[PDB]
Design a binder for this molecule. Structure first.
Ligand SMILES: CC1=C(CCC(=O)O)c2cc3nc(cc4[nH]c(cc5[nH]c(cc1n2)c(C)c5CCC(=O)O)c(CCC(=O)O)c4C)C(CCC(=O)O)=C3C
Length: 309
């Protein structure tokens, strides 16, 4: 019997025509304004027409499927992609595991940190799917940022970029660690999310040559409601104002692929700020389908299966 690997991710439009139904799914049934759509289309057209996230996510899931199976002869994993706001939806993927006869599955979200607005939404949807059909049994991974190979991978990348900065200027360099912002209300109820990213920033900092680091947030929502701060653009200005850093190294470690939230929020917005103040901009490559990142996920999944009992 095969074991299902439910790999979950946010989803990205495949075509310009998908944008509206995508935006509406994101807005939970509320249809965006025609101008709103326009702006989103403009964003996607800034980064090069559409996001590579669709092909990256597939490489990541079928790369992990392959990596798990090539490293053992006890089980055969079958990977099923379940996106959040576009097809193949989470529910489509569970329905497929049922049809194919999967009895047990291990679900993983391509987002190392847990939050009530992200990972918890994925897992509730997949398990509500699994219960209506009566199969497969889904054993969910909730977070994997504490994985040593995960921390070492980012530290190695940051150190690669750092060595390419003049040593006389490395003391004027700062590492910005960030993730998707969320409505600050999550802290009222003890969400581990903000604390998990502080741990990720600390774990990495100890393993890099960059002498300074700060935690930031990106893609904050327009809701009048407060959101987790500071924003990476405001933090860059605040940091340059107090310390006059020459180099800014951005690591959006809450993400695992070069998609819109990285290519826009960092590679364009943060870069604008550094140019305005006169600082340099650095952004290490994201994990994407790199064999090291796939080995991180293979170890994450092979440990969940070992401790499944
Ligand atoms: C926690 C989190 C992650 C990380 C974990 C995970 O991966 O799940 C993430 C990832 C991503 N978010 C993405 C894109 C978008 N997120 C939006 C809107 C929102 N995201 C939110 C949360 C998150 N999002 C929230 C609270 C909203 C508010 C919507 C509402 O009003 O209820 C919107 C709408 C317009 C806008 O405001 O930007 C878009 C287009 C893409 C795809 C990029 C591409 O296509 O390449 C990716 C990987």
């Amino acid at each position: 019997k095969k074991v299902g690997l439910l790999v979950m991710a946010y989803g990205t439009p495949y075509k310009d025509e998908d944008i509206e139904r995508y935006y509406t799914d994101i807005r939970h049934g509320h249809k965006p304004s025609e101008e709103m759509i326009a702006d989103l289309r403009g964003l996607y057209h800034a980064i090069g027409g559409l996001s590579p996230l669709a092909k990256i996510t597939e490489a990541q899931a079928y790369g992990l499927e392959k990596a798990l199976n090539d490293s053992q002869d006890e089980v055969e994993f079958k990977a099923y992609i379940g996106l959040k706001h576009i097809e193949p939806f989470i529910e489509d993927a569970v329905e497929a595991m049922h049809k194919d006869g999967i009895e047990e599955a291990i679900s993983i979200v391509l987002a190392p940190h847990y939050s009530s607005f992200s990972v918890e939404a994925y897992n509730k949807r997949a398990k509500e799917a699994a219960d209506k059909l009566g199969g497969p049994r889904i054993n969910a991974i909730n977070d994997w940022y504490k994985q040593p190979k995960f921390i070492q991978m980012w530290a190695d990348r940051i150190n690669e970029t750092a060595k390419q900065i003049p040593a006389d200027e490395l003391l004027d360099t700062v590492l910005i660690v960030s993730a998707h912002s969320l409505p600050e209300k999550i802290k009222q109820h003890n969400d581990p999310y903000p604390n998990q990213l502080q741990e990720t920033a600390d774990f990495i900092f100890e393993k890099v040559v960059v002498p300074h680091y700060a935690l930031g947030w990106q893609s904050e929502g327009k809701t009048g409601e407060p959101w987790l701060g500071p924003d990476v653009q405001d933090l860059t200005r605040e940091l340059y104002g107090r310390e006059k850093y020459k180099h800014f190294i951005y690591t959006p470690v809450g993400f695992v692929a070069e998609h819109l939230e990285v290519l826009y929020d960092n590679d364009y917005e943060c870069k604008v700020v550094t140019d305005e103040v006169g600082a340099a901009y650095h952004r290490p490559p994201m994990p994407n389908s790199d064999p090291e990142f796939l080995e991180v996920l293979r170890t994450v999944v092979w440990e969940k299966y070992s401790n499944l009992e």
